[PDB]
Amino acid sequence: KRIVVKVGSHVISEENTLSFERLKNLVAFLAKLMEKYEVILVTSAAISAGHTKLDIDRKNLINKQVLAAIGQPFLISVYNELLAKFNKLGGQILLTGKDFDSRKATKHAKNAIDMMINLGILPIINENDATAIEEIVFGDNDSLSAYATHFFDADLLVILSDIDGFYDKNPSEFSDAKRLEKITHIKEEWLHGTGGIVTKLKAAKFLLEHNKKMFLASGFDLSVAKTFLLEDKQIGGTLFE
Amino acid sequence: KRIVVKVGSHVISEENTLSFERLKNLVAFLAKLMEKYEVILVTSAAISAGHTKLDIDRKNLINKQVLAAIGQPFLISVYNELLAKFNKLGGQILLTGKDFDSRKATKHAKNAIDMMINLGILPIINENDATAIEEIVFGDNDSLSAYATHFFDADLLVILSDIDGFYDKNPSEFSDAKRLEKITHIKEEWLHGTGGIVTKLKAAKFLLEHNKKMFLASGFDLSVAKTFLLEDKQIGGTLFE
Ligand SMILES: Nc1ncnc2c1ncn2[C@@H]1O[C@H](COP(=O)(O)OP(=O)(O)O)[C@@H](O)[C@H]1O
Ligand SMILES: Nc1ncnc2c1ncn2[C@@H]1O[C@H](COP(=O)(O)OP(=O)(O)O)[C@@H](O)[C@H]1O
């Protein structure tokens, strides 16, 4: 069983810094996951990381690309210092949605990833923000992680988010919103920023169409994600299957 | 006036370590060039950098991709530590030859690069070894650096190398080999590893055909390159124009 874990920007960053508390917790979780599964990490937050090195505004798209260029290698260095605690290494992979249309590009990427996994190295994927901007504009890697799950032959995508699950209505607006534990179909009526719930549901529709699964849970408190993946009991979050 | 400096793996590597000395020398040189020019760096040695962290056999191709994934971000952090001496930052760009065929990918890349240069950030380009292997197999970024030069609107590509220039015959094999100081045409008759002189000549042919220039010079002794670029005077190397 191979899983893809996707962590959004908010999960690993505050507005002016990286969240070392949350990164530490995530990395300890990934180290444990790696004993039980083959694990691929899809990370965001290169822009946050770059912003710690260069204080320019994030609204302009081209500014975001520059910040990502500066931030990406530093973000990887942070993951590597934290992984060192568990005697693990992380390898950087940059991909775009268009790479996934290419048999050749996908095959080369899968070769590297498969071998990393074989050596117990953690593959860490992010968008190539030099050549593509889709995930910077809208989605924050939700789609990229879904494509990775299918094309690298993983069984499950786990999205760790500031959203703890999918509800019958917006849970931040409506205190009576009820959590949907299981979704087997994504309604078209359900479908610029991080992407919100819509990019999460679009990723799920892609995965459902390729007979794969998605689990949506909190990256702020890892209890639900931990119990699902390590205790095989669902006590929160939404499973799409 | 904009230039690409390409540094090969030999020039910044030793047998089982990075050449920190020659990197330091390179960065000091780049810091002075930035006073006079818009500068783009194309670097190799992600594989050497990775072998420093992971002891697997460098001769296998998929191993090289893995070593590059680990090494690339570490290599960038070493550039950054050296650039901090001049209060400079580097930003990572990963490209492939195939990216250069797409107008959209190249455009997104140039947008980021142009802005980095405006802001004073050094763009540091390498091949994306997840999705392409061409330069790993044969050429060591000669061709990628030629494409970068043309498509990001630089006037001159400087290749820094083992060899101090292009010669009328192989200077390793012949004591009377004469160095050709200026070259106006690439004879088709002149046309796996780092590539030898031929990938350098293919690069020059590409650039002459696009009304651009190339300077082949030593990366071990920077005097010829420094004098050529900072003192507009050729005392060595080969100029292609
Ligand atoms: N039906 C719904 N179920 C869950 N969350 C929803 C729903 N409708 C709206 N939201 C809201 O979407 C918001 C944006 O999510 P977002 O911040 O993009 O997640 P991430 O940062 O992990 O991408 C959340 O604050 C959430 O409250
Ligand atoms: N006509 C020539 N001019 C210069 N070098 C040549 C020529 N023919 C063969 N060579 C060989 O090719 C080498 C340059 O290629 P390479 O070792 O790949 O350089 P780099 O260190 O830049 O990767 C030279 O050191 C030389 O031994």
Q: Which residue has tokens 């992600």? A: B46
Centroid of ligand 1 to alpha carbon of A194 (angstroms)? 9
Are the C-beta atoms of A117 and A158 separated by less than 8 Å? no
- CB distance B93–A56 less than 8 Å? no
- Strand ordering across the sheet containing B182-183: B90-95, B122-127, B38-43, B2-7, B156-161, B213-218, B238-240, B182-183
**Closest CA in chain A for residue B131:** A105
A194 marked as binding residue: yes
Q: Using CA atoms, how far apart are residues B113 and B67, in angstroms rounded to an integer?
A: 26
Q: Alpha carbon of B179 to those of A156, B10, B166, B169, B241: distances in Å?
A: 60, 21, 6, 8, 16
Interface with chain B: mutation pick from A66, A111, A147, highest number of B CBs within 10 Å: A66
- Is the Cα torsion angle A20, A21, A22, A25 positive or negative in sign? positive
Are the C-beta atoms of B162 and B11 separated by less than 8 Å? yes
Which residue, B217, B196, B241, B156, is CA-closest to B26?
Answer: B217
> Cα–Cα–Cα angle for B142, A95, A137, nearest 5°?
115
> Cα–Cα–Cα angle for A176, A203, A22, nearest 5°?
70
Are the C-beta atoms of B94 and B72 separated by less than 8 Å? yes
Three-state secondary structure along chain A? CEEEEEECHHHHECCCCECHHHHHHHHHHHHHHHHHCEEEEEECCHHHHHHHHCCCCCCCHHHHHHHHHHHHHHHHHHHHHHHHHHCCCEEEEEECCHHHHCHHHHHHHHHHHHHHHHCCCEEEEEECCCCCCHHHHECCCHHHHHHHHHHCCCCEEEEEECCCCCECCCCCCCCCCCECCEECCCCHHHCCECCHHHHHHHHHHHHHHCCCEEEEEECCCCHHHHHHHHCCCCCCCEEEC
- Which chain B residues have a beta carbon less than 8 Å from that of A108? 65, 130-133
- Per-residue tokens: A27: 């990395």
- Beta bridge partners, B213, equal B156
Which residue, B149, B147, B144, B148, is CA-closest to B134?
Answer: B144
CA dihedral B80, A137, A139, A194 (to 10 degrees): 80
Chain B residues 81-140 with CB within 8 Å of chain A? 89-95, 98-99, 102, 105-106, 108-109, 111-113, 115-116, 119, 121, 123, 128-133
- Per-residue tokens: B201: 């000549």
| List of residues 6+ apart from B117 with CB closer than 8 A | B2, B38, B39, B40, B123
Concatenate the DSSP letters of all residues of chain B into one string: -EEEEEE-HHHHB-SSSB-HHHHHHHHHHHHHHHHHSEEEEEE--HHHHHHTT----TTSHHHHHHHHHHHHHHHHHHHHHHHGGGT--EEEEEE-TTGGG-HHHHHHHHHHHHHHHHHT-EEEEEE-TTT--HHHHBTTTHHHHHHHHHHTT-SEEEEEESSSS-BSS-TTT-TT--B-SEES---GGG--BS-HHHHHHHHHHHHHHTT-EEEEEESSSTHHHHHHHHS---SSSEEE-
- CB distance A69–B93 less than 8 Å? yes
Please list every protein residue whose CB sits less than 6 Å from any atom of ligand 2. Answer: B 8, 10, 140, 161-163, 166-167, 169-172, 194-197
Print burial letters for B135-148: b (CB count within 10 Å at least 16), e (below 16): bbebbbbbbbbbbb
Q: Using CA atoms, how far apart are residues B213 and B211, in angstroms rounded to an integer?
A: 7
Centroid of ligand 1 to alpha carbon of A7 (angstroms)? 14
Q: B138-141: long-range contacts at Cβ-Cβ below 8 A with a sequence spacing of 24 or more?
A: B138/B192, B138/B193, B138/B195, B138/B199, B139/B194, B139/B195, B139/B199, B140/B8, B140/B9, B140/B44, B140/B193, B140/B194, B140/B195, B140/B199, B141/B6, B141/B8, B141/B42, B141/B43, B141/B44
Q: Indicate which atom in ligand 2 lies nearest the CA of residue B160.
A: 22
Point out the annotated binding site of B for ATP. Answer: 6, 161-162, 167-172, 194-200
Q: Using CA atoms, how far apart are residues B71 and B37, in angstroms rounded to an integer?
A: 29
- Per-residue tokens: B157: 């590509």
- Per-residue tokens: B186: 């690439």
Point out the annotated binding site of B. Answer: 6, 44, 129, 141, 161-162, 167-172, 194-200
**Experimentally determined by:** X-ray
Q: Alpha carbon of B115 to those of B91, B120, B122, B149, B226: distances in Å?
A: 11, 9, 10, 16, 26
Q: Does A62 touch chain B (CB under 8 A)?
A: yes
Q: Does B18 touch chain A (CB under 8 A)?
A: no
Q: Alpha carbon of B65 to those of A48, A102, B70, B133: distances in Å?
A: 27, 18, 9, 8
Q: Alpha carbon of B146 to those of A38, B31, B193: distances in Å?
A: 39, 22, 18
Q: Does B62 touch chain A (CB under 8 A)?
A: yes
Q: Please choose from B13, B138, B141, B170 the residue to mutate so as to test ligand 2's pocket, defined by most ligand atoms within 8 A of CB.
A: B170
Question: Which residue segment(s) compose the domain that B87 sits in?
Answer: 1-241
Indicate which CATH number applies to the domain containing A83: 3.40.1160.10
A13 marked as binding residue: no
Instruction: List residues in chain B that are followed by a break over 2.5 Å (C to N).
Output: 191
How far is the alpha carbon of B75 from chain A, nearest alpha carbon, in Å?
9
Q: Please choose from B163, B201, B214, B221 the residue to mutate so as to test ligand 2's pocket, defined by most ligand atoms within 8 A of CB.
A: B163
Q: How many domains does chain A have?
A: 1
Strands A238-240 and B156-161: unpaired
